[PDB]
Ligand binder design. Sequence first.
Ligand SMILES: [C]N1[N][C]C(C(=O)[N][C]C2=N[C][C]O2)=C1C(=O)[N]C1=NC2=N([C]C(C3=[C][C]=[C][C]=[C]3)=N2)[C]=[C]1
Ligand SMILES: [Mg+2]
Ligand SMILES: [Zn+2]
Length: 313
Amino acid sequence: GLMQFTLPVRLCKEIELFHFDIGPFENMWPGIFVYMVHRSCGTSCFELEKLCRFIMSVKKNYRRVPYHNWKHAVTVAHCMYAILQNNHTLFTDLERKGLLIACLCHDLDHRGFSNSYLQKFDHPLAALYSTSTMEQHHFSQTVSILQLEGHNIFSTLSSSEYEQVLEIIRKAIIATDLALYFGNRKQLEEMYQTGSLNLNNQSHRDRVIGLMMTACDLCSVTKLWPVTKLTANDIYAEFWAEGDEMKKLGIQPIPMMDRDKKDEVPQGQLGFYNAVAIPCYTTLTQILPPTEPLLKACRDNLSQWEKVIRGEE
Ligand SMILES: [C]N1[N][C]C(C(=O)[N][C]C2=N[C][C]O2)=C1C(=O)[N]C1=NC2=N([C]C(C3=[C][C]=[C][C]=[C]3)=N2)[C]=[C]1
Ligand SMILES: [Mg+2]
Ligand SMILES: [Zn+2]
């Protein structure tokens, strides 16, 4: 019980900041996550034997795809850790528990193809789950891993606490479907402006956790420019593979997925930053003021893409 994970000094300091990169040493990523659980949650939150077994089985169920891989999972959990650590008193013990686990599991068994491609391929998952196809799959994979012998990290919760945390996880993972983000953010926008936003209202908390999940999910745009720029190559390697697979079904893909249109990536990143990323981190910062560093880094990266376009890089 007296066994802390500890990190080298540079990581011990940098892990607290929103723009932390977890590094290229895959074998340190489980320890980093357990470190983040122990500080966010407590050393008592999980049996270490059970947590370590859960983590290794989650790792094994991410695939070797360029972007939606085990690295993304730990990265997305770290951004949640940093939100939770900058908003100590806003979240319950059950929420702190659920959200780190939700972020770690949120893209389980991703194949590097969007919901649209699954529907166009007529994949069996698109028959089983008509909307939020992959996300319903990610949550399905999370429940399966929780039910493997020795992997039930929530075994010590009361029945009703267990139903509540699985409900926090289901809604957190469903919320990573960016098709749902547009409406969720607009409703949060209205609610904050008219002053109806109430964090004692569960339906409002659920909306706020949704936006946190989108923010953590998109957090590649909140890193230092060298990280954002090199992660962009990984995001596009998937998009362009999906484009290729569209052309093999006889469908012209959108330009974002057509490798023949790589030239326009800079203007494509602007659109994304203006239509999704900035609105996301703006409303997050209005609801949760200590998350302002994510909006600041997002805007620094917008200004870097503006420089790429002007030929200065
Ligand atoms: C979903 N998602 N997630 C994440 C992302 C990113 O992306 N994010 C970002 C990042 N950074 C780093 C990493 O990641 C996204 C998107 O969507 N994006 C996007 N992109 C693009 N668009 C368009 C384009 C184009 C390209 C080319 C041509 C034309 C057009 N591109 C839209 C959207
Ligand atoms: Mg996803
Ligand atoms: Zn994701």
